[PDB]
């Protein structure tokens, strides 16, 4: 199929700061990826983002009823919906399952990589650190980064490049809002 | 900034596809099945706490379709440029032999919101147990999407997520196997 496509998008955004104490509503219209007109509650009228949106900004701004619907939205839409969903979204906490296991930089070698797998957590903000004999190791650390699973959980793998020696105790430490103290997992060669 | 909630909509011509969903911090709260006119909660439990009248989505999508007509003309019929996806295959959790796990095919940074996605096991399409999300909005106004395949990990099977998109010259296959 080589027929040309044309796409319209709309994003009605509610931005929350300190719960519902400070709230900003941003109503956005797009042609393909180009935002062409928006209402920003900071402004209280529509503004054209590109020339394409000038006719809509000018007309919608002439319609007092449309403007007042837009102006109330921070309250009747944003603050309202925050109220409706906050208990299972804002307050959602899922603690991670932490596993540590050795790996190889090349399938033929011995083990020269330690993996700290952190799975299934929510929300996304997390701090994962490696320790060797109680001292934090900051060199040779690499990660997948934060990975969304698409099902309201995240995961991340944090690797330590090291050749383990007998006697050494490695510790992966995880800090996350679902945790009241750091979660630590030990691994020994 | 603590949190963002977005009611995201699109309408695509000539496909006549429209979508309506709510996003919280990058995760889908729910979408509306336009054909069935039903609210589909991303997690089962969400719907015990909240409701949404699906009919309102249909009304919005109708406006979006009319607006697309208008904007298409304003643009002098300038079509969208295809942006092919990045595709990653990973598992839900660390893989162990014969321990139930889930393959995730993550399809990211693409537009228009149209793809054909197939799971292949040993080079053969598989459909039992599969599931997928709708098209999820990105802050750069492209799209992302997830497909899922529960599986029992063995050394016998290899897997591929095959993704077709108009921005690709040929289907993109991303491989996964044990070890």
């Amino acid at each position: 199929d080589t027929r040309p496509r044309f796409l319209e998008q709309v994003k009605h955004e509610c931005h929350f700061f300190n719960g519902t104490e400070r709230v900003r509503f941003l109503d956005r219209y797009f042609y393909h990826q180009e935002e062409y007109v928006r209402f920003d509650s900071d402004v209280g009228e529509y503004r054209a983002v590109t020339e394409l949106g000038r006719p809509d900004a000018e007309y919608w701004n002439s319609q007092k009823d449309i403007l007042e619907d837009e102006r109330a939205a921070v309250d009747t839409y944003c603050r309202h919906n925050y109220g409706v969903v906050e208990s299972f979204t804002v307050q959602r906490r899922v603690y991670p399952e932490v596993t540590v296991y050795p790996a190889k930089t090349q399938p033929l070698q011995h083990h020269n990589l330690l993996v700290c797998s952190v799975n299934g957590f929510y929300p996304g903000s997390i701090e994962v650190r490696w320790f060797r004999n109680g001292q934090e190791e900051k060199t040779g650390v690499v990660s997948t980064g934060l990975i969304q699973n698409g099902d309201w959980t995240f995961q991340t793998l944090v690797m330590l490049e090291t050749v383990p020696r007998s006697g050494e105790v490695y510790t992966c430490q995880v800090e996350h809002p679902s945790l009241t103290s750091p979660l630590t997992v030990e691994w020994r060669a | 900034e603590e949190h963002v909630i977005i009611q995201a909509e699109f309408y695509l011509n000539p496909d006549q596809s429209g979508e309506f969903m709510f996003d919280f911090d990058g995760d889908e709260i729910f979408h509306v099945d336009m054909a069935k006119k039903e609210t589909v909660w991303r997690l089962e439990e969400f719907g015990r706490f909240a409701s949404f009248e699906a009919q309102g989505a249909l009304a919005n999508i109708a406006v979006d379709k009319a607006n697309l007509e208008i904007m298409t003309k304003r643009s002098n019929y300038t079509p969208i440029t295809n942006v092919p996806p990045e595709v990653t295959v990973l598992t839900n959790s660390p893989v162990e032999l014969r321990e139930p796990n889930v393959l995730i095919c993550f399809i990211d940074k693409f537009t228009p919101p149209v793809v054909n996605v197939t799971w292949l096991r040993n080079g053969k399409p598989v459909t039992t147990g599969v599931s997928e999300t709708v098209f999820l909005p990105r802050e750069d106004h492209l799209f992302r999407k997830f497909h899922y395949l529960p599986f029992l990990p063995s050394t016998e099977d290899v897997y591929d997520c095959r993704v077709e998109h108009w921005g690709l010259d040929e289907p993109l296959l991303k491989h996964w196997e044990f070890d």
Partner: peptide, 13 residues
């Protein structure tokens, strides 16, 4: 309780 939708507005023909 019910999630409220934000209406999308018809542009100028």
């Amino acid at each position: 309780s019910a999630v409220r939708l934000r209406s999308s507005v018809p542009g100028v023909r």
